[PDB]
Subunit: 140 residues, 6 copies
């Protein structure tokens, strides 16, 4: 891992997104679903937040850090037969938080899949990519 | 999590795959790359194996288990501008290993991305899906 | 830790309970609450399940094990100004699961407290005790 | 979890307490006990200190942080048939340490229980509450 | 990691040893020391037991497993100016426990060092080696 | 653990070293070895870096911290029949990084041993000691 003690101190931020594609009946169960007993979206939200706080433990050369805010948003899209996962991570440090946002969106997607495993076996996860990161200024 | 003490004991197995898409110059650095100093493929292999052994800690309702074998294979495909990650997990128990194989392929893909972060910012991960799992007998 | 390789193999089980006492207005927010956005009960359920799977990592002389089933049930009791947390853990092994059930009820109670921290500062947790465990046969 | 990058920088502190109630003979073994071979108090002290450093990993929406000081004090009270656990946590940051102090007292109490499991099965843990926290200034 | 599902089931065992060398005054403090407040030997014993249970998480290609018994023994040797750490690990499985015993002796040695850091800076750890392991039958 | 909020803020650094002694044929396999498929040195490097980031989780009274740079260097020495492991850790904080450097060198040494287990059973690890640390100014 590269030294980070030199350039430092600013408000760093990143937003990532992930998708889980599935059948309509599978998506119907999730939606009907929410606000009940074992809400798939709520479980996935929690897992995503725990995952981002463990990013340095999963990616060998990532640097440990204090996240100040982590947000995992889920949205069902019946029109395209899939779930959209949007994440946001923020902190104040020397290094950015792009791996933390991607990691939360990936483990959220993996949790959705885990909970729908018994119904549909051919669900696909992807794509998983960044949306923004702030001398970089990456937006849209 | 659902009880698993009833149906049990057999050779369970699963294979998963993941893709990281990038520019040609980015892929050129990785390849040239290997067998040198900070081999991106070697790092990613290791991370993937550690990730699969932590699957129960990341996915809230997964069950803890003894993996007997975990294999993470990487292959560069200059033709399609991307890396192919193929994983394989095996054990002998009551539950299957589909989440362990998907988790190893996802964290391997995340490690490739982490190490190429400074060069290309718009790399895409996906798709991430299963290939096989064995009363199920899921092949191809 | 005492050796466990001798006496072994059976269906072990335990049930534990915990209580969080608070003001009526505090309990009113939780209840109104559920099935919405950041459901306190759902968060606490998840944390409790993750905690039980990490029991050997928190209690120095506990033995690692494969839990087959973990259940965290929450119930609001406006009559006594508090939340009742009931847990259940099961497995098939040489050792019992009393520490796993107590640990899930304690971290569930701690999560309820964490999420209500800003409102009421004098909330009390307790008691935390066992209800059953099965040559022991401990019931009621 | 709520953003913490705004209000920040001060000496934060909290003190928590926990109780384990048991039979006189059970308490007699612990006391007689100490300064010997497998000192129950020493084990519990250690576990409590490790638990507080893992608080963000157990409570889903807690924020990671650098504790500067963690103290777990145990005191046997034959008069009331129980052990008193008193904890203290300190750091310098944006967020307080109330969950870290409560978590150390709870896992210390759980370790005392674990080690006395074979003797008495009806030991009770509780109450578990805060004593102080420092614009808050919560004392006594 | 190599597959282990084939050859399996037996009582596996291993014993390891480690040494910390130091000045006489440093060793005098440790000894005088024990059975008091922050017993260096007791802390080191605990850490060693937690380390062995995390061996699969530290050594990338080790296999997860259920240890049934872990023992960390410390003995002060004023004659040679050092501490002797002896460990023992046991289980019933397909794989041996040589890495678990070496890992517990190494982290015990590291804990002794940590606690004596402020006094002597040139303490040396070593050697760290195996003593026995049981178709192998390695003794003495 | 001792409070660290008082004296603070500087560039802290430490370098540690470890040795694994083995037969010539064993060392020959490792060397021939590198830049191939399951490079022993690469695996050991990775493990060492993950270990240093977990030091506070293994040594009970160590303080959590943000490492800014961790370096694990391996060098084969056929002349003395062994591997030399040299580590370097850096950060900017109140506490030093001597335990982080020793911990990375110890787990790197343990990984080398793990991977050569099947060939030679009497390999020895040691010594494990510090080389430098910076009001201290410890060099050579």
């Amino acid at each position: 891992m590269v030294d980070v003690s030199a350039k430092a101190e600013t408000v760093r931020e990143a937003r990532a997104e992930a998708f889980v594609t599935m059948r309509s009946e599978t998506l119907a169960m999730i939606i009907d679903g929410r606000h009940h007993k074992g809400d798939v979206f709520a479980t996935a939200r929690i897992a995503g937040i725990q995952a981002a706080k463990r990013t340095w433990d999963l990616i060998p050369l990532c640097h440990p850090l204090m996240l100040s805010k982590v947000e995992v948003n889920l949205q069902a899209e019946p029109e395209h037969n899939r779930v959209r996962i949007e994440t946001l991570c923020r902190l104040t440090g020397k290094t950015g938080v792009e791996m933390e946002a991607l990691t939360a969106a990936s483990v959220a997607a993996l949790t959705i899949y885990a909970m729908c495993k018994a119904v549909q076996k051919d669900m696909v996860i992807g794509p998983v990519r960044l949306l923004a990161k702030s001398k970089s200024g990456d937006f849209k």
